[PDB]
Amino acid sequence: DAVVGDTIIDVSGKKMTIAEFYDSTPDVFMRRNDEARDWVKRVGGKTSLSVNTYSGEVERKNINYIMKHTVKKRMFKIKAGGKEVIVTADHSVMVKRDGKIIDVKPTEMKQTDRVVKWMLTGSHMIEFIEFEIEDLGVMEIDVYDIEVDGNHNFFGNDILVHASVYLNKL
């Protein structure tokens, strides 16, 4: 589960696509299987924006890992505030539901849910906004994820999505 490679992310305050960020990251592999088309790289010295789901505050946190997998999966577009993010069906988007920020699959969203969108104006850095969903069908596609320390979410095209955690198990 992940987002598409053209998704724009914050890397230490600069903007780039997540695929560009993956390609720019040195080949320090935590996991590599070319046949399964599955890669995890360690990241050093980079941060991104996230939301603390307990305090509700935006926090800048270290990026620990970046992942790339080529998948054949059902894809959904989340549209909110003139921005959009394309995610796999198995990947969680963050929503404000009943006063709490939680992770939900694109197939399980409610009409009363709101997505969390980055803001360029006003005293608040985020807004909770109505949204639409579009089913893009099944695609064979490179998808990417980052592990964000502590908060396990990140903004893709200004929309908050759940991050993966790679547990460095062994």
Residue numbers in the entry: 0 to 120, 120A, 120B, 120C, 121 to 166
Publication excerpt:
Split inteins catalyze protein trans-splicing by ligating their extein sequences while undergoing self-excision, enabling diverse protein modification applications. The cysteine-less Aes123 PolB1 intein (in short: Aes intein) found inserted in PolB-type DNA polymerase genes from T4-like bacteriophages of Aeromonas salmonicida shows only about 30% splicing efficiency relative to its PN12. In this work, we identify β-sheet-dominated aggregation of its N-terminal intein fragment as the origin of its low (~30%) splicing efficiency.
We then designed mutations within the predicted regions of the C-terminal half of AesN. Amino acids were changed to ones with a lower propensity for forming β-sheets.
